[PDB]
Amino acid sequence: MREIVHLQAGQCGNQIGAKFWEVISDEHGIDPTGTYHGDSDLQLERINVYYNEATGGKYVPRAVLVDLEPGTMDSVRSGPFGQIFRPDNFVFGQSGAGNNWAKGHYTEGAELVDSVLDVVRKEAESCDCLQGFQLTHSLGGGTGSGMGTLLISKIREEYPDRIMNTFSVVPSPKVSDTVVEPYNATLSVHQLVENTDETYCIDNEALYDICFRTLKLTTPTYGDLNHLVSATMSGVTTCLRFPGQLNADLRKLAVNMVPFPRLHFFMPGFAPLTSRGSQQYRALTVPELTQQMFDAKNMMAACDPRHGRYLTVAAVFRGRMSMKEVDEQMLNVQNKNSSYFVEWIPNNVKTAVCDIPPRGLKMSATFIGNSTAIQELFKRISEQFTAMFRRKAFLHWYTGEGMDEMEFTEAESNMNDLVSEYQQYQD
């Protein structure tokens, strides 16, 4: 049948894949040991898109986890769900990248690529037909960016007929910890632009502000913020997983989304975010759902598109809902701000509803937006790159690995190409 196998890479992927997979497992009601507890016929039937089954009712995940430092994988294995992950999928190098993009792109990749390809093709032969692969990494990751670029380069021709879905968190515009993250991210996106199809953009300042906004609980964990983002990505996944008249396939969505190839950077959206007393202080109705989902602050990816306008929007709805409410909500938003849409296309609105409630909450939703707000983001990155390339800071490592400024010249030429691209289209 038709399934999905996942690539987990980078030290963010370390925690992110763990949280995401355990969220899925709890959503499907399996014990931490691994023996499913019979409660959901639909999920038992449809598990075959994500998990293979092992002797013992053990729906083994088809996720390939890769990094270099053994400590992270040791901690993950010691984690509550290390058992769900197999020694087969525990592949790693025995050294450190220094989070250097060039090192992780040419030096240690040169030795790990064979084995990682081996694992992924092992799973590929094991299964019949994929929609493709989705990746969890960050462009803000010194190792994730390089190794992910390597593997996408390896595979986009190997399976030229699939989905290259990617999940990546942009470093905080106010602070990037490392000073060379701009260089690493610039090179990474230079390779990503011609290869990928989908990229979900994430930022952590927005996560902190959401915590201060509705979580309001002072001291959560980065793991809990991963809980939230994993809930979002799980919601976008469940479309295939579950019934209800909505056209689920990620290609169904993408062909409906991307007006022209160069659009690969995307803004998610999510549904009820609830505080300590708002559970009993909330009237759970579709119209206020719509208001919250299209709030000015409910966005969580990059920044307020209030500067710019709207290109495409898709709204998926998880629970017991009807057609008329979402239809009239579309009408009402269209009438509320027809101006804030782009004239080249009306009805940027795309609708999809699954009739299966989430566990814990009855009716909810997810949203994905392609809007004109990433421009200021990569204008930032352009400015820092121009500044740091003006004096050529921190370059002797890259030279010693064997690169040159010529690469950066054409990469930033391409970035300016995308700059003018967006400015022409939405301006």
Binding site: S40, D41, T55, K58
Partner: protein, 168 residues
């Protein structure tokens, strides 16, 4: 005195969880049947179920989803022991008692006892295996269930004469 239906509501909620778990139940059952090799029989005795479960059950569900079926058929006997003594009973309650006593059995004739609307079990059921076999096996539970809820349905109308029949 009413607690029989208090237990019964949990039992029927389990039956609805089985309503979710019915195609899965037969999905495992057919793999069990292939391995047990006795395909020429209408499945009425749970001895076929035991022959199915003692072996080739290397996948989690293979044990639980079969064993709770024996668990519920034991639980119904636990309830029926309460009905056995209570009061002697009006003739209709008596008849319900004795027929349920008979129908509670290991290898009985509960093979092709298909029922009336709604009883969606055979409706949801697929094909020839379900129309030549898979008769009483899927419907015997609600049959006993309704014929035992009529037992309480006359209990509120049991007069002062019947309030003391076998309790005294």
């Amino acid at each position: 005195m009413n607690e029989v239906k208090e237990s019964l509501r949990s039992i029927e909620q389990k039956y609805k969880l089985f309503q979710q778990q019915q195609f899965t139940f037969i999905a495992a059952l057919e793999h069990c049947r292939e391995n047990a090799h006795d395909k020429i029989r209408p499945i009425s005795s749970i001895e076929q179920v035991q022959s199915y479960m003692e072996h080739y059950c290397n996948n989690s569900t293979h044990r639980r989803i079969l064993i709770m079926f024996m668990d519920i058929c034991s639980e119904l006997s636990k309830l029926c022991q309460h009905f056995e003594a209570l009061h002697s009973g009006t003739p209709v309650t008596n008849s319900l008692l004795e027929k349920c006593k008979t129908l509670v059995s290991q290898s009985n004739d509960l093979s092709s006892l298909r029922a009336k609307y709604p009883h969606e079990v055979v409706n949801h059921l697929s094909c020839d295996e379900a129309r030549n076999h898979y008769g009483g096996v899927v419907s015997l539970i609600p049959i006993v269930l309704d014929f035992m809820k009529e037992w309480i349905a006359h209990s509120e109308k049991l007069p002062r004469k019947v309030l003391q029949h076998g309790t005294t």
